[PDB]
Amino acid sequence: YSNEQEQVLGQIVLANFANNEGLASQGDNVWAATQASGVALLGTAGSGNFGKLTNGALEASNVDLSKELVNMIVAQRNYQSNAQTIKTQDQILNTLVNL
């Protein structure tokens, strides 16, 4: 304030789950608690199992595009192989029908 005096207005709470992978993604880069994720354990930053907060900074995504551009290639090849199997079974059924 202007009288050279600080006042606290609230403290950010942090939630940690027993099973992070059990959280259901609801979009808007937002997760939802579910029974598989367990009940949310609330606490303060820097205490217990909660990491500290970095102010003035943003956490970027963990997507590594080199790795993804590789993967995509592997999945394309697997998909085409499965389509080859499909067409093989198609030719088999055509052979049996043509009798």
Binding site: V13, E59, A60, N62
Partner: protein, 151 residues
């Protein structure tokens, strides 16, 4: 017969969709990459009927902490989740730190969900951790004067 290759094709399509979603979110603060998990589908016969998608597993690893210089960008290092509430009162959790001060003086994210936390009560106000989390607000309410009691 057909169902085997059908399941294989469906699994490959799901994997490609997950990869495409990961790529489309290359630059999205608070996003965690996803990976499809596959499992066998044996049923009595040893021929291996097919494959199924057991689920999608997130990779909850810390991303890069990039400096932006704003005072409402806060990043959670290591474990932790920001707690948010919508207009219905449903509780959500997110790793995003893009908070904006709205017209009602509450701390909300880009989509408008209100950030929650322990409120301050009393004079002088102190964080009372025995209460349930409440939305954080920053009023302009002038601060009143305190007559001296100890010098």
């Amino acid at each position: 017969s057909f169902s085997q290759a059908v399941s294989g094709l469906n699994a490959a399509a799901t994997n490609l969709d997950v990869i495409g979603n990961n790529i489309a979110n290359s630059a999205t603060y608070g996003f965690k990459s996803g990976t499809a998990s596959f499992a066998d589908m044996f049923a009595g016969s040893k021929v291996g009927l097919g494959v199924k998608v057991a689920g999608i597993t997130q990779d909850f690893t810390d991303g890069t902490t990039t400096n932006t210089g704003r005072g409402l960008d806060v990043a959670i290092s290591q474990n932790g989740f920001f707690r948010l509430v919508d207009s219905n009162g449903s509780v959500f959790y997110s790793r995003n730190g893009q908070f904006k001060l709205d017209e009602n003086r509450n701390l909300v994210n880009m989509q408008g969900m209100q950030l929650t936390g322990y409120p301050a009560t009393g004079t002088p106000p102190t964080i009372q951790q025995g209460a349930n989390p409440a939305p954080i607000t920053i009023p302009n309410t002038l601060m009143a004067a305190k007559s001296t009691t100890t010098a």
